[PDB]
């Protein structure tokens, strides 16, 4: 019809032009055998793919009958294992993954992640490599508004004062100078390779000199000093001339750090993409940054420096980028056969976000050793992750590349993959980059699997149950015991609360503690802070500390977050209800009305969280998991969306084209798909949103295309 014919495929006009007449040219791929090459891998996937996705039907259909025909642990974990849902642990290996990059391998440091169809929001992302920690001070609650020092129209001298502090403070525990403070410094010079700085009545060096990176302008009077302190940089810009650097003891003008050392370019839950416009739109971005021309406005360049010892070096400006393709569930009318059956998207985004990285190799750049970094979502146990593996080393061969040159980051967020991690790991043993963990997704697989046992406990309880505690520290026990310190990442979740950077600041460094590389951040400002606490925590010591250590059983893994009897109170349901009713409508909204996965949403109580899709399976799964067991009723759901929805209306009336659902709730393709999502919810596969969440944004589209 629209569409282009190659073998059995039908590609939609849109991509197949763009691959053409965009991606391809530069690759030394030939255009026809690319497409016969993706006409190929389809047919022989497809039907794998699909094995896959019933295998979890199954397992699922099993499970749900045996809580019905009933709580005996050790029979429970027997029968899992009868089923082929617990697999046998394999022996111990050590990951073999080579051509890593050392962002990778060795730095400790925080991870944005940014909804690849947002040009803007991903040109940041690559630039926050390195952040201005004053920009960062003043701009957010980490410095209390409190007394003279709350911001305004104007620049307040008390709050630039307070930002100073403790950027001074920062540095006497990251770089601490042989004697006194950074805060009584009047000067920096580099005397014969030695950084020596002016103390008002004497002068010192750090007491470990090794810290010392460089400099910048000359050696008696520097423009800037370089530090290095657990891998991560630290530089001081000395400016006596510019404004903040008038005012202060020793010229400084700034504090930058070394903040997102990667970043993920997301076409996963971040993002609304339900068609061939949508996927063009994110290819297009991700072909910009791997060109890296890029802009709306360009992409950083790296950053010169003189050594210590007077010579010329350089370290890279921009984060090293992965990109999210989506998991193994859904497809996309980009490409139909001629039955009309979509194509499978995790397989298209395999061959098209992998044909466009190979700009990323070549001259701008990213990959300095020649790896592309794939993060897979939502795979389920370890066949489904050396599907993956398959899948990534046939797309190699159509683009010509070395074998394991796609490399893997397998996301933790499925039971059948937490209770069968190191089998996973060792599926993708070579090819295997990075493991995390995260609340949302996993929460919800957790609610689904368990759905016909009982009652589940709230949602905030979750954070708190001997199941995902127990999984948390699981996580990072098997790749340490993989070998992955020093070779590949451990990461754990997102800071969720924008606003609330002091909170991030005093909580989040719980993650390095507990042995994470890695953690994910909302913003550049947030990465920013965030790095405080790789400076604080020095995380290969940790997770050298943690080796050899089972600290988590299958017995807790196992653990149901079921509800013990009459838990609640008839308004503590009430409660729960509602705030996940908010939920849903909250996120819905934007998702469906306007194709936004992700944004600054207040929740119930109007703070500013920043989910991705996630959210919603979590919520529906909950309140369905309650439909389904009596706590309940459809009149109590009905009711609350009712309630919730005007609410939500308010928190958009700073909108400039939103549109009400209340009070004509039925009219709403939004309301519809929210209610949808919770009354069809235990009905959808492992719980997944996108079914029905797809669907309602193709349909507000084609309602509007009148
Ligand atoms: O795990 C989350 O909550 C989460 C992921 C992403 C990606 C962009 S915003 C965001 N939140
Ligand atoms: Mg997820
Ligand atoms: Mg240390």
Redesign the pocket.
């Given at each position: 019809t629209d569409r282009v014919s190659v073998g059995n495929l039908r590609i939609a006009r849109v991509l197949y032009d763009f691959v053409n007449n965009e991606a391809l040219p530069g690759t030394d791929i030939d255009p026809d055998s690319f497409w016969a090459g993706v006409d190929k891998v389809v047919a022989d996937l497809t039907p794998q793919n699909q094995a896959l996705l019933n295998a979890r039907d199954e397992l699922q259909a099993q499970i749900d009958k045996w809580h019905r025909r009933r709580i005996d642990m050790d029979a429970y974990r027997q029968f899992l294992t009868e089923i082929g849902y617990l697999l046998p642990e394999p022996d111990d290996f050590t990951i073999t993954t080579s051509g890593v990059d050392a962002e990778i391998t060795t730095t400790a440091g925080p991870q944005l992640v940014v909804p690849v169809l947002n040009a803007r929001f991903a040109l940041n992302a690559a630039n926050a490599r390195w952040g201005s920690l004053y920009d960062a001070l003043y701009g957010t609650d980490v410095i209390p508004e409190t007394d003279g020092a709350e911001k305004g129209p104007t620049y307040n001298k008390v709050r630039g004062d307070k930002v100073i502090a403790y950027a001074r403070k920062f540095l006497d525990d990251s770089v601490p100078l042989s004697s006194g403070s950074f805060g009584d410094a009047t000067g920096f010079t580099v005397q014969d390779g030695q950084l020596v700085v002016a103390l008002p009545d004497k002068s010192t060096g750090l007491a470990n000199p090794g810290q010392f990176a460089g400099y910048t302008g000359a050696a008696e009077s520097p423009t800037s000093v370089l530090l290095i302190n657990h891998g991560l940089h630290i530089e001081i810009l000395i400016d006596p001339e510019s404004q903040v650097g008038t005012t202060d003891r020793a010229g400084v003008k700034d504090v930058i750090l070394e903040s997102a050392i990667t970043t993920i370019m997301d076409f996963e839950?971040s993002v609304a993409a339900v068609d061939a416009a949508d996927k063009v739109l994110g290819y297009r971005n991700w072909l910009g940054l791997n060109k890296g021309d890029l802009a709306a406005r360009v992409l950083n360049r790296d950053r010169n420096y003189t050594a210590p010892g007077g010579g010329q070096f350089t370290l890279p400006g921009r984060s090293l980028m992965f990109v999210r393709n989506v998991g193994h569930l859904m497809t996309n009318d980009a490409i139909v056969d001629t039955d009309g059956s979509e194509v499978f998207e995790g397989i298209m985004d395999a061959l098209f976000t992998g044909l466009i990285a190979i700009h990323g190799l070549k001259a701008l750049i990213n990959s300095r050793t020649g790896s592309i970094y794939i993060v897979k979502?939502?795979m389920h146990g370890p066949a489904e992750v050396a599907f993956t593996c398959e899948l990534f080393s046939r797309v190699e061969d159509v683009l010509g590349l070395p074998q394991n040159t796609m490399k893997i980051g397998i996301?933790d967020?499925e039971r059948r993959t937490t209770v069968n991690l190191k089998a996973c790991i060792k599926a993708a043993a070579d090819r295997v980059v990075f493991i995390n963990t995260?609340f949302?997704?996993r929460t919800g697989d957790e609610i689904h699997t368990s759905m016909e046992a009982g009652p589940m406990v709230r949602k905030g309880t979750m954070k708190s149950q001997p199941w995902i505690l127990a999984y948390e520290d699981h996580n990072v026990d098997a790749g340490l015991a993989a070998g992955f310190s020093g070779r590949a990442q451990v990461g754990k979740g997102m800071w969720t609360m924008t606003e609330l950077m002091a909170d991030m600041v005093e909580t989040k460094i719980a993650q390095p503690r507990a042995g994470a590389s890695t953690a994910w951040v909302p913003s550049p400002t947030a990465a920013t802070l965030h790095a405080l606490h790789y400076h604080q925590v020095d995380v290969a010591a940790v997770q050298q500390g943690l080796a050899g250590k089972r600290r988590a059983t299958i017995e807790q893994l196992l653990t149901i977050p079921l509800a013990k009897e009459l838990a609640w109170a008839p308004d503590e349901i009430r409660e729960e209800v509602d705030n996940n009713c908010q939920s849903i409508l909250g996120y819905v909204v934007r998702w469906v009305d306007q194709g936004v996965g992700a944004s600054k949403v207040p929740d119930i109580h109007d703070v500013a969280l920043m989910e991705?899709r996630?959210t919603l399976r979590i919520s529906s799964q909950l309140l369905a998991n309650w439909l389904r067991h009596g706590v309940i009723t459809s009149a109590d759901v009905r009711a609350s969306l009712e309630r919730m929805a005007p609410l939500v209306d308010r928190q958009n009336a700073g909108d400039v084209a939103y549109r009400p659902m209340a009070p004509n709730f039925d009219d709403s393709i939004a309301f519809l798909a929210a209610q949808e999502l919770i009354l069809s919810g235990a009905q959808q596969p492992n719980g997944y949103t996108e079914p029905i969440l797809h669907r309602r944004r193709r349909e507000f589209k084609a309602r509007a295309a009148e």
């Open positions: 839950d979502p939502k996301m967020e995260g949302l997704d991705d996630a």
